[PDB]
Amino acid sequence: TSDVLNLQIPTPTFGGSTGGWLRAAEIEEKYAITWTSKKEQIFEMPTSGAAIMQKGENLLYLAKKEQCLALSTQLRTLFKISDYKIYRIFPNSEVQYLHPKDGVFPEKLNEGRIGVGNVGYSIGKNPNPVNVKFTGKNTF
Amino acid sequence: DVSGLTPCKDSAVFKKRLDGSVKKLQARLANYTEGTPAYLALEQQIDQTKARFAKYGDKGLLCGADGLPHLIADGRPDHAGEFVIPAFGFLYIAGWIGWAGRSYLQFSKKTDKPNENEIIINVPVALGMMSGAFLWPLAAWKELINGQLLVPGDEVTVSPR
Amino acid sequence: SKVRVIVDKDPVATSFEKWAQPGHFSRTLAKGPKTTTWIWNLHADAHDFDSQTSSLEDISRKIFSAHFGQLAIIFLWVSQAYFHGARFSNYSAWLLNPTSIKPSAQVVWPVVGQEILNGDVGGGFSGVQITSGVFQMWRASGITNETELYWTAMGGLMMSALMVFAGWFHYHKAAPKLEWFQNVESMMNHHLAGLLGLGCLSWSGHQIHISLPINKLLDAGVAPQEIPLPHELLFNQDLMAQLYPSFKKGLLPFFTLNWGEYSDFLTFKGGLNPITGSLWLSDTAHHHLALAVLFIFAGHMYRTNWGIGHSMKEILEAHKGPLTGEGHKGLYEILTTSWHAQLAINLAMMGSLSIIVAHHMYAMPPYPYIAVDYPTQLSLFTHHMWIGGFCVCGAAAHGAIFMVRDYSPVQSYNNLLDRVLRHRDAIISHLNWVCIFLGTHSFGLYIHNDTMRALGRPQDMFSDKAIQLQPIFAKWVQSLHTLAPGNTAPNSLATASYAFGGDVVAVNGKIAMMPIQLGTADFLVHHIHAFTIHVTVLILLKGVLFARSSRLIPDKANLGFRFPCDGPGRGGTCQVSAWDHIFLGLFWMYNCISVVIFHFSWKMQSDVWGTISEKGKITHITGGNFANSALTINGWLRDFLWSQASQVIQSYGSALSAYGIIFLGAHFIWAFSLMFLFSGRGYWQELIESVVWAHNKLKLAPAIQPRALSITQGRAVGLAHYLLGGIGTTWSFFLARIISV
Amino acid sequence: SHSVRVYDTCIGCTQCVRACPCDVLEMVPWDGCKAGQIASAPRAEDCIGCKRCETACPTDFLSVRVYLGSETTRSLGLTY
Amino acid sequence: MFLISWRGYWQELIETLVWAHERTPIANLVKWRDKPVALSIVQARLVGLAHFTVGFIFTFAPFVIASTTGKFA
Amino acid sequence: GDFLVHHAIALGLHTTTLILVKGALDARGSKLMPDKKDFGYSFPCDGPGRGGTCDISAWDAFYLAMFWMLNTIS
Amino acid sequence: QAALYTHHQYIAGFLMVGAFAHGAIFFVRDYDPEVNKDNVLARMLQHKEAIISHLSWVSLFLGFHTLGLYIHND
Amino acid sequence: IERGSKVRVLRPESYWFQECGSVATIAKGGDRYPVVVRFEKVNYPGVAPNNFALDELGEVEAP
Numbered sequence A: 001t002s003d004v005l006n007l008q009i010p011t012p013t014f015g016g017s018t019g020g021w022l023r024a025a026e027i028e029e030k031y032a033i034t035w036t037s038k039k040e041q042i043f044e045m046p047t048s049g050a051a052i053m054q055k056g057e058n059l060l061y062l063a064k065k066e067q068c069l070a071l072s073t074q075l076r077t078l079f080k081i082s083d084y085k086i087y088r089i090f091p092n093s094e095v096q097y098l099h100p101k102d103g104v105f106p107e108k109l110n111e112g113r114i115g116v117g118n119v120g121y122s123i124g125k126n127p128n129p130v131n132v133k134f135t136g137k138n139t140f
Numbered sequence B: 001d002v003s004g005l006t007p008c009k010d011s012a013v014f015k016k017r018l019d020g021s022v023k024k025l026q027a028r029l030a031n032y033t034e035g036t037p038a039y040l041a042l043e044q045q046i047d048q049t050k051a052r053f054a055k056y057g058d059k060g061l062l063c064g065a066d067g068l069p070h071l072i073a074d075g076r077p078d079h080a081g082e083f084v085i086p087a088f089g090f091l092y093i094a095g096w097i098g099w100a101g102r103s104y105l106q107f108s109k110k111t112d113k114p115n116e117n118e119i120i121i122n123v124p125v126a127l128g129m130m131s132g133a134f135l136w137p138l139a140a141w142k143e144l145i146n147g148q149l150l151v152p153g154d155e156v157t158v159s160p161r
Numbered sequence C: 001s002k003v004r005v006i007v008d009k010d011p012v013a014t015s016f017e018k019w020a021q022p023g024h025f026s027r028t029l030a031k032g033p034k035t036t037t038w039i040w041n042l043h044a045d046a047h048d049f050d051s052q053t054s055s056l057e058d059i060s061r062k063i064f065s066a067h068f069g070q071l072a073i074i075f076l077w078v079s080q081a082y083f084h085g086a087r088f089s090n091y092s093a094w095l096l097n098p099t100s101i102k103p104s105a106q107v108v109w110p111v112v113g114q115e116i117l118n119g120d121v122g123g124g125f126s127g128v129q130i131t132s133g134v135f136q137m138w139r140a141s142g143i144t145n146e147t148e149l150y151w152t153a154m155g156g157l158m159m160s161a162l163m164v165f166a167g168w169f170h171y172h173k174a175a176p177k178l179e180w181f182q183n184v185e186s187m188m189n190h191h192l193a194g195l196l197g198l199g200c201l202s203w204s205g206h207q208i209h210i211s212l213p214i215n216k217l218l219d220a221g222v223a224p225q226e227i228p229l230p231h232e233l234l235f236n237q238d239l240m241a242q243l244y245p246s247f248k249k250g251l252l253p254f255f256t257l258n259w260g261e262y263s264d265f266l267t268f269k270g271g272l273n274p275i276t277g278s279l280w281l282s283d284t285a286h287h288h289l290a291l292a293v294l295f296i297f298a299g300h301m302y303r304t305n306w307g308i309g310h311s312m313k314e315i316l317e318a319h320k321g322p323l324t325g326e327g328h329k330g331l332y333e334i335l336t337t338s339w340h341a342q343l344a345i346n347l348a349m350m351g352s353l354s355i356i357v358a359h360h361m362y363a364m365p366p367y368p369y370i371a372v373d374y375p376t377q378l379s380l381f382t383h384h385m386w387i388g389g390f391c392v393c394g395a396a397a398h399g400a401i402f403m404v405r406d407y408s409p410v411q412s413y414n415n416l417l418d419r420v421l422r423h424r425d426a427i428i429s430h431l432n433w434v435c436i437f438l439g440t441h442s443f444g445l446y447i448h449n450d451t452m453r454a455l456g457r458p459q460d461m462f463s464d465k466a467i468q469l470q471p472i473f474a475k476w477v478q479s480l481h482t483l484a485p486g487n488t489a490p491n492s493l494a495t496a497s498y499a500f501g502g503d504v505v506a507v508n509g510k511i512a513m514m515p516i517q518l519g520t521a522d523f524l525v526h527h528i529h530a531f532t533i534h535v536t537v538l539i540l541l542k543g544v545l546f547a548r549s550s551r552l553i554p555d556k557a558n559l560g561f562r563f564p565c566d567g568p569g570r571g572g573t574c575q576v577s578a579w580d581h582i583f584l585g586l587f588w589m590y591n592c593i594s595v596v597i598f599h600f601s602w603k604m605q606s607d608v609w610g611t612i613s614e615k616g617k618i619t620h621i622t623g624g625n626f627a628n629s630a631l632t633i634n635g636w637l638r639d640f641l642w643s644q645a646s647q648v649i650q651s652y653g654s655a656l657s658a659y660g661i662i663f664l665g666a667h668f669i670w671a672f673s674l675m676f677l678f679s680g681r682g683y684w685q686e687l688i689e690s691v692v693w694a695h696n697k698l699k700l701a702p703a704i705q706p707r708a709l710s711i712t713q714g715r716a717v718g719l720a721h722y723l724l725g726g727i728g729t730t731w732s733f734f735l736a737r738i739i740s741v
Numbered sequence D: 001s002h003s004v005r006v007y008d009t010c011i012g013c014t015q016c017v018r019a020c021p022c023d024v025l026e027m028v029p030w031d032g033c034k035a036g037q038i039a040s041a042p043r044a045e046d047c048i049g050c051k052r053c054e055t056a057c058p059t060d061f062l063s064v065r066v067y068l069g070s071e072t073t074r075s076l077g078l079t080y
Numbered sequence E: 001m002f003l004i005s006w007r008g009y010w011q012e013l014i015e016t017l018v019w020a021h022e023r024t025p026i027a028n029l030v031k032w033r034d035k036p037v038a039l040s041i042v043q044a045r046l047v048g049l050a051h052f053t054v055g056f057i058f059t060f061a062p063f064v065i066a067s068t069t070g071k072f073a
Numbered sequence F: 001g002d003f004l005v006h007h008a009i010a011l012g013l014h015t016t017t018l019i020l021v022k023g024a025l026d027a028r029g030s031k032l033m034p035d036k037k038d039f040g041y042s043f044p045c046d047g048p049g050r051g052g053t054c055d056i057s058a059w060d061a062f063y064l065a066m067f068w069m070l071n072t073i074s
Numbered sequence G: 001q002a003a004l005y006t007h008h009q010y011i012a013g014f015l016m017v018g019a020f021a022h023g024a025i026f027f028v029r030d031y032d033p034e035v036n037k038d039n040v041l042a043r044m045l046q047h048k049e050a051i052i053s054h055l056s057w058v059s060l061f062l063g064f065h066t067l068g069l070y071i072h073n074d
Numbered sequence H: 001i002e003r004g005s006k007v008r009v010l011r012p013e014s015y016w017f018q019e020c021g022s023v024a025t026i027a028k029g030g031d032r033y034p035v036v037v038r039f040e041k042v043n044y045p046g047v048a049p050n051n052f053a054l055d056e057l058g059e060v061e062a063p
């Protein structure tokens, strides 16, 4: 999708945990994940505890991308939900779309992606670190 | 003699150690009634101590100022009862063990399940190699001359350097 | 009839076929070894039945049969003590004089000069001195003859064979179903009544009919060979009435509720027997009767086939409050569907019980002439401390295993487990603050005392001649216990134990038990104990609570219970698993138990154990130096370790030389542990590659490729070596010290 | 931020992308193997460096390589 | 300490302490500039090794000086 | 006793030389990590993959040989 | 007399470890394989496995034998 | 080289450098490493085969 997030999506019913985001989420960086459910059931939170996911649409704020992707892995390998979307909320109310970027999962091939970081030789043909001395660059 | 050492048969401190060793067990002996197996065990200990000291005196060992035997690992012929003859004995036995292990390794490599032949030993074949490793200095020399003992060197894996 | 026996017939065929197929229990290891890691994985996964089968019924059957095999091993271990007492001991000569003959039931073979270990233990016998206390245990049962020990050993062998047969039978012939094991109410009733209460009742019967008359005759001065045999005492009301003049009335006062007529052999006199320095055996028999009645009464609580009784599901679900949400709901299913939770509870209870046994058997010597046998007391205390510490670490280990594997969020929503997991940072933070506060205070008082004594300022110390820290609460509790007989124990003749104050008890010069005075050093070392226990609790509780997830790693439960790390990422995720938390907490358990047993040894050698002469002149072993030397770390180092290692370092050439050998070897093993504990796998793998090059050059490459030990295995090997070396050094030091003084 | 590189010994078996917990890797089309795809690292600023991709590579001496470098609040995995 | 215990245990402990400082009154007004993290792996090995060496030297020097001084021979 | 302790000293020298020479010669790479020169002289590890790579750099070889130097000097 | 000897021996151990550490650093980021083609320095890396294995043999032999003699005397 | 040949690996960063393996399949296409070689010794991850180029194999025995 695009960089838009519905702030009024209902949240899973949770009793409050001591694992939530700290002061540096309203200051630096915050993440949210939204998914669609078919029934009311109980899932384990990545910040400990258990929460009931609402039937319909859900929204949940986390502190790092690892927590959102671990929750997405739980929503995949368990009871099948595969339309989750992970965002990144800045303190100036600016949202950025991260997971399912091109609309499809990264493991499936998608025409229109550009290879980044690809190297045109085997790993044993990197230059020696003597040849990059006093240059600032590296042999990667 | 060598290094200022005296023979243990001609050393007074060795005899003093003999007397102290037998006197400690004799003092331990005085609280037991005769004929009891404790008394027999203690007098057997006394006899064993006397026999050990007499053997150390008779074998030609050299004792120092502390009255203890000192081994000369020099290689002199008169001290070949020290290091050199046990050296030859251990070298023969260790080569026996190594050649038996190597022969069974070759056999287990040449089979269909090399892994299962090493956790579960083929006992008849293992006993065969184990007993046939008695002529290891000749078989190893024959394999060295035939070029089967050593890999050329371009066929063993090596780190990139 | 809901509670019933349902049993499968011939589930598993008895065959020597999977014996020749190692690693058959798991899917991965059954395909054969490729490297030398399949061996260690085979050894590590042998008893992990939860990873071998997904069926709880087969897991329970394996557990039951393994319990039978363990009980067979324990029966063989009882039989060894009885047989060595029968055939290889000086138990008769010890019975004729249990104050100058040293117990010994272990003789060595003379082959290599090791016959010097057969020391002069007295009674015309040569052997290794025994600190197990089995001799006093047999004397407390009336086993004055050496035939009864032999037949007890034979019966133990028969029972071990019975347990082996039962273990084969219940896994290969008649394996119970899952519904049999889940009858926890029936199991609880049957254990509480038939095991505990009937064992207490039968042991009280044996005590009353055998050990009371035999020990009374022994304390009267009758030699053991002129004492009536126990079968001659069992059916002789005339002889028992001669000894205890209440058997004339027979069993009639028992049924008429005139139990006061049985006060000749069922007493509550308390204190210690002056002849033996132990508890009165009439008190012991009365104690076992009270326990038997209490346990049989308690075994009638839970519901079975008949309508009376409790359901444990209804008791738990009724206990809930405002601050805890749903309360104990869902714990019944947790404890009836998981074995790891039951381990996590039972191991904690058994470790705490062993520690309680250690604290109770020194101040209340229960066996005759065991108080004046100082090596026995020291060995039993230190033994039960180490067993308790190991079990209390294992409880946290299995709690972590349950949390990783058997936890379910749908089952345990908003109950006590969920609420604990939802605020674990607060728990760990506050316990961290308590650990820091206790450590700074308890250890910095020692360091401050070191600095003041080194600076020549003894008036600024924390001592009794200086700024005082008197344990006023412990002294008040001691004064309350000393005034208990008559006031708050009105039908009591003496105090519960003389450690709370009272009279010195002496048996043939040696001190059995005397009052233990508490000063500022005792306050300091008790705070040290509290701090060490708190840090061990912090490590283990943090491992249990953060076993599933944390802020660092959100998906720690998907990695397993034990795993080395999650890479060098996030700055480094080394030792994040709950297994590594148990590995770290075992060291702190070792530290805590070592300090506890050091405190016990020094305080008992300094203020309790010793000799008495004319006009009550008390001379202790070390001279009462604990009050002024246990205030500094230098005082500990100089006056405990350096001063009491003289016995273990000068034991060469005597009967205690094995203790010096084990001292040196345990130092070697403890130092050998740091090789695994400090280093890492990759260096050893590269060194193994360099060795494999030479092997490949000489056509000596094994098909099972040699690999370095894994990271978890390297940590486990280092920890096991560390614990073995430490416990061996302390074992040899204690035994060589206390045998020789 | 760490730097992730994928070399041409890739076989396109996708295990590195599945093993990634931070959505760093993705599959782009390619013609150098039978699967017709090569791994790519377009979001290396979200790399934490846990090297789960390098554990999942089946090729002899892994094609996807993570070099630990500068540390930020994302590569350190800090929630505070 | 640093030679046997490794980063993960200490990083989780630091995170709990960070929550403790951020969520207590009065003291949460005092705010750090650098986010507290556990020592890195190589840094931990260096610190433990430096501790090992300094303790080694400072426990052998007093012995080799005082034992010779305490005997004069 | 001089004979035995001289043999102990030779043991210490040879083992410290073993650790240091192995680190120096495997600093550029080994079978477990053929591209060790790309990661520098000092780095934590290469992850838990392919068995585990604790203490794999040459700096870790220095760190291991420091203990052996202290032992033999003692 | 005691302090000066222990002083200089510990400093000798430190300098000895540092020399090998800097040789490892030189191998990591200063050694040019094309400049040292078939050199006396590259041949050291050519047969490094033999060197490490023989240091392993000497260290294991010395440790086995001197510890066995010491434990025998004990 | 052909399918079933015995080859020696010349790739220096490979686990089986200067080691003998068996060719399993030679792909005919645009693959940069078409030859599949299977080995009797697993590496540190435990993987037996690997894809190799035609210039990285020295050949030992014909099918």
Ligand code: CLA
Binding pocket: B097, B098, B099, B100, B101, B102, B104, B121, B126, B127, B129, B130, C690, C691, C694, C695, C698, C700, G053, G054, G056, G057, G060
């Ligand atoms: C019979 C098998 C065998 C043989 C011939 C060798 C031969 C050799 N090993 Mg060796 N080794 C073996 C087994 C064997 N090893 C095993 C099982 C281990 C693991 C514990 C090692 C660990 C090892 C190391 C760590 C080192 C050597 C080294 C060496 C070389 C120098 C000699 C030495 O140090 O011996 C010392 C040998 C040992 C300490 C291990 C002995 C273990 C037992 C006693 C031998 C195995 C016998 C086997 C079970 C017999 C079963 C066969 C039967 C069914 C017929 C030499 C090429 C050194 C080297 O590279 O020098 C160039 C070196 O540093 N080895």
Ligand code: CLA
Binding pocket: C063, C064, C067, C068, C071, C180, C181, C183, C184, C186, C187, C190, C191, C193, C194, C195
């Ligand atoms: C009154 C009946 C009774 C008794 C005495 C026991 C006793 C025992 N059960 Mg048990 N159990 C019972 C009923 C009973 N159970 C019922 C009804 C169930 C089903 C709900 C179970 C289910 C159960 C399980 C699942 C397990 C046990 C286990 C155990 C043992 C615990 C280990 C221990 O304390 O060692 C104490 C050791 C002894 C006391 C030694 C004596 C051993 C014998 C077998 C005890 C009985 C002897 C006999 C009846 C008395 C004869 C008296 C005669 C001399 C006059 C112990 C032997 C555990 C075990 O170890 O398995 C083997 C275990 O895993 N039980």
Ligand code: CLA
Binding pocket: C043, C044, C045, C046, C047, C048, C049, C347, C390, C391, C392, C393, C394, C395, C397, C401, C561, C562, C579, C582, C586, C720
């Ligand atoms: C009631 C006791 C009890 C029981 C039934 C279990 C049962 C279990 N534990 Mg456990 N544990 C216990 C007590 C117990 N533990 C205690 C007290 C501790 C604290 C130390 C632990 C710590 C612990 C850990 C940390 C782990 C387990 C694991 C396991 C499981 C697999 C064990 C296995 O396969 O090992 C097979 C058995 C062996 C490999 C034998 C071990 C031999 C020891 C290390 C050496 C003993 C030396 C000896 C005493 C003296 C030698 C002297 C020398 C001179 C020769 C299994 C369910 C593991 C698991 O994955 O659980 C799911 C696991 O990771 N446990």
Ligand code: CLA
Binding pocket: C432, C433, C435, C436, C437, C438, C439, C440, C443, C444, C447, C535, C538, C539, C584, C587, C588, E001, E004, E005, E009
């Ligand atoms: C003698 C060695 C030693 C010492 C001093 C410590 C000290 C500590 N360890 Mg520990 N540890 C050690 C060995 C040691 N460990 C080993 C070998 C291991 C490996 C198994 C571990 C594993 C380990 C774990 C796993 C944990 C600890 C924890 C702790 C801390 C407990 C909290 C506390 O009371 O701190 C207070 C400080 C002290 C007790 C020591 C100093 C006391 C001084 C004398 C008084 C105060 C001085 C003051 C602060 C500074 C003034 C002087 C200055 C101005 C110059 C503390 C820092 C725990 C922790 O940090 O959680 C709270 C924890 O979880 N350690």
Ligand code: CLA
Binding pocket: E050, E054, F041, F042, F059, F062, G014, G015, G017, G018, G019, G021, G025
């Ligand atoms: C003439 C001698 C000499 C010189 C010029 C250098 C120079 C250098 N070394 Mg070096 N080194 C030396 C001797 C020397 N070393 C010796 C003898 C050893 C063996 C112990 C080492 C081991 C060594 C290693 C392992 C490494 C270096 C590195 C370096 C380079 C960077 C230095 C750096 O970052 O440190 C900056 C300064 C510090 C880190 C200060 C740390 C303070 C130390 C730990 C002592 C602190 C303990 C303190 C005294 C305790 C007080 C006790 C009190 C409380 C009682 C630099 C080129 C590093 C490098 O860049 O290589 C690629 C590197 O990795 N060296």
Ligand code: CLA
Binding pocket: C668, C671, C672, C673, C674, C675, C676, C678, C679, C687, F015, F018, F019, F064, F065, F067, F068, G056, G059, G060, G061, G062, G063, G064, G065, G067, G068
């Ligand atoms: C007292 C503690 C201790 C001991 C004994 C050792 C022992 C050893 N370390 Mg070591 N190490 C330690 C602490 C210790 N380390 C610490 C704290 C560190 C810091 C992390 C290291 C770091 C370290 C490194 C980095 C290296 C070693 C190496 C070695 C080996 C040197 C070769 C040797 O002496 O073989 C002798 C073997 C022994 C002393 C082990 C005991 C074997 C048995 C029990 C001896 C019994 C005597 C007699 C033969 C019995 C007959 C056997 C019978 C079956 C017939 C050896 C296994 C080096 C190595 O592996 O090279 C080969 C190596 O590279 N260690």
Ligand SMILES: CC1=C(/C=C/C(C)=C/C=C/C(C)=C/C=C/C=C(C)/C=C/C=C(C)/C=C/C2=C(C)CCCC2(C)C)C(C)(C)CCC1
Binding pocket: C078, C079, C152, C153, C154, C155, C156, C159, C198, C201, C202
């Ligand atoms: C040492 C040992 C041993 C032995 C043991 C024994 C010897 C045991 C015994 C046991 C016994 C010998 C037991 C018994 C028991 C009994 C009982 C337990 C009884 C009960 C009774 C009752 C309970 C009663 C009731 C009643 C009443 C009161 C009323 C009503 C009626 C009637 C009568 C019913 C062995 C060898 C094994 C091994 C080793 C160790």
Ligand SMILES: CC1=C(/C=C/C(C)=C/C=C/C(C)=C/C=C/C=C(C)/C=C/C=C(C)/C=C/C2=C(C)CCCC2(C)C)C(C)(C)CCC1
Binding pocket: F024, G019, G020, G021, G022, G023, G024, G026
């Ligand atoms: C006259 C005399 C004599 C002789 C003497 C001599 C001849 C001696 C020598 C000695 C020697 C001869 C010594 C040596 C030593 C050596 C060493 C000690 C070495 C070391 C090395 C190192 C440390 C290395 C380093 C490095 C690296 C690692 C890498 C590369 C670079 C470098 C080089 C930096 C006699 C005895 C007859 C007697 C009389 C007198």
Ligand SMILES: CC1=C(/C=C/C(C)=C/C=C/C(C)=C\C=C\C=C(C)\C=C\C=C(C)\C=C\C2=C(C)CCCC2(C)C)C(C)(C)CCC1
Binding pocket: B073, B074, B075, B084, B094, B095, B096, B097, B098, B099, B102, B136, B140, C698
């Ligand atoms: C005269 C003498 C002496 C000296 C000695 C010496 C100096 C020696 C040297 C020696 C040497 C300088 C040696 C070298 C060597 C080299 C080599 C190179 C070797 C090799 C070997 C091998 C190769 C083996 C193999 C095998 C076999 C054949 C058997 C077993 C198995 C195996 C495969 C392992 C002394 C004074 C002590 C004493 C007196 C006498």
Ligand SMILES: CC1=C(C/C=C(\C)CCC[C@H](C)CCC[C@H](C)CCCC(C)C)C(=O)c2ccccc2C1=O
Binding pocket: C675, C676, C677, C679, C680, C681, C684, C707, C708, C709, C710, C711, C713, C714, C715
């Ligand atoms: C030495 C060491 C190794 C190498 C250790 C290995 C390969 C263990 C070898 C096991 C042997 C083969 C078992 C038998 C030992 C001897 C053959 C028998 C000795 C018997 C004595 C009682 C005399 C690691 O793999 C390792 C991994 C992680 C952290 C630290 C370390 C570590 O310190």
Ligand code: SF4
Binding pocket: D006, D009, D010, D011, D012, D013, D014, D015, D016, D017, D038, D039, D056, D057, D058, D059, D062, D063, D064
């Ligand atoms: S796991 Fe490795 S080989 Fe497979 S697609 Fe990813 S980078 Fe390529």
Ligand code: SF4
Binding pocket: C569, D004, D019, D020, D021, D022, D023, D024, D025, D046, D047, D048, D049, D050, D051, D052, D053, D054, D066
């Ligand atoms: S290091 Fe971790 S986050 Fe980065 S690409 Fe590899 S698996 Fe993904």
Ligand code: SF4
Binding pocket: C564, C565, C566, C567, C568, C572, C573, C574, C575, C680, C711, E006, E041, F044, F045, F046, F047, F048, F052, F053, F054, F055
């Ligand atoms: S155990 Fe080794 S590989 Fe794992 S994080 Fe620690 S240093 Fe890295």
